[PDB]
Amino acid sequence: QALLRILKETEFKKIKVLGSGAFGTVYKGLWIPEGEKVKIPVAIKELREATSPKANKEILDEAYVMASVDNPHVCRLLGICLTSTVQLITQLMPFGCLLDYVREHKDNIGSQYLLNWCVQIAKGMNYLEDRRLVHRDLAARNVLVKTPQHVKITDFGLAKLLGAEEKEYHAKVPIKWMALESILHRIYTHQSDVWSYGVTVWELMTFGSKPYDGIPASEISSILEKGERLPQPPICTIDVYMIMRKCWMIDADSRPKFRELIIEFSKMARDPQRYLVIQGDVVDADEY
């Protein structure tokens, strides 16, 4: 497939810095297709130079698979701009990430919503799993809100790009969302994505709580083998907490499977009150 526009530096424009990341910067910008009067709002993620342990040929390869994900719950790479720095063009999400969303609404968010988002993130992930792909960096900060009732998983592929996989590579890494095998041996698989998924749900049930507050990154491995795990969210019924605890098992193949999770959460979403107890010119990526 193609579906990956290759843009020239004069076909996009960086307007405002959305926010800065660990290895780059994101931007509120405009896509301006050469040879036509159209301006499309987009998000431009620019990776810092020499930040990726890969040459351009390899980079562009991965961008094709990135630009080839077709699922309502996974964002699609729209275009790329390879030079002395790689820039990623994706659709602009006006309502930001889901983490900041559950934080701003520490409460006025009902159960139905929470279990809903869990089903969706489980759908995007399963999709990837079927296509035999590993996200390697799933977190509530990496889930964007298209509309309150439809969230998409963003940043597919980025980690593999920044060289997560590369064995000998010695570059930050999201330790607090990583499975023991990822932290210990840098092994990434679908069952290691499940751990991150379990951490993600946790972030959502706590309305944006930081995992292992205070606990240094370096201690996380030791605390995990000692048997420690993120605590049961207050609004969570033991039935819900266990599923998360099952995503945090040492044995990778023991952990649930996104397919099972979709059914397990789809079930609870039919009677949420029982499983969660809460008190209460400028076109568009779409029109193109």
Added chain:
Amino acid sequence: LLRILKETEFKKIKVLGSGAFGTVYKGLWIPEGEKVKIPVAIKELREATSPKANKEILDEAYVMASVDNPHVCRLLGICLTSTVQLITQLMPFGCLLDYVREHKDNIGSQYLLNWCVQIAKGMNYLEDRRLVHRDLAARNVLVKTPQHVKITDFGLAKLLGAEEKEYHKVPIKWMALESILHRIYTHQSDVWSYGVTVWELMTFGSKPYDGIPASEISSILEKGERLPQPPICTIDVYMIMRKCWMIDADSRPKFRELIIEFSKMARDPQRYLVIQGDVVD
């Protein structure tokens, strides 16, 4: 032209920023029945914020919804209850004040003079339909694209009671002395604000009279003080600004004359300014 919405045809998703008498939200306009979710910006006015009755509020809202110019945002809808809510189109790139701040020097003459022409245009438009903005300022100019700015918040000041003399925060440092002293608002009082606005743009975001209380601005204006010549400005360009800050209101430039003096400069910018070089929408 003014859609009247039910408190169920729109959702306030994220707070853009809660200003003086209210809050601006980033939400979704879900036309009842239709199958669309349009991103919009919802500004909600605090309660009792306005000294007027809804019956009248709606009137102004019809006017606000009638502004038809590419350089003046248009009131898409309204939701009248115990609070008034204004639905306008969402400007993802924000306002221009924040833009010149985040680009202290990446912006060349061509742009700056350009924006001055556009703002002059939107403003002229309102004068022509016999309307007064009353609160023009860099923060009230939103960026649709780097090369097209439209004036936002037409109507708000009026609504919040600027004209109701009897009715006791006001953008003092952008107001014509006649506004500050007698609460008088006219096209020629908008020109003063316009000059202060060009001042903001020419200083890449500087604050007007930074350090001087507001209760004192009335003084230093009669004492003859005015905003200092911006570094990148040529005296040719600075006088246009100074002329906008005259005591004799009818002696200040008119927008129609400003659209021409700035357009003339916009032809040879380097000579008037000196710098270093579901979801439709």
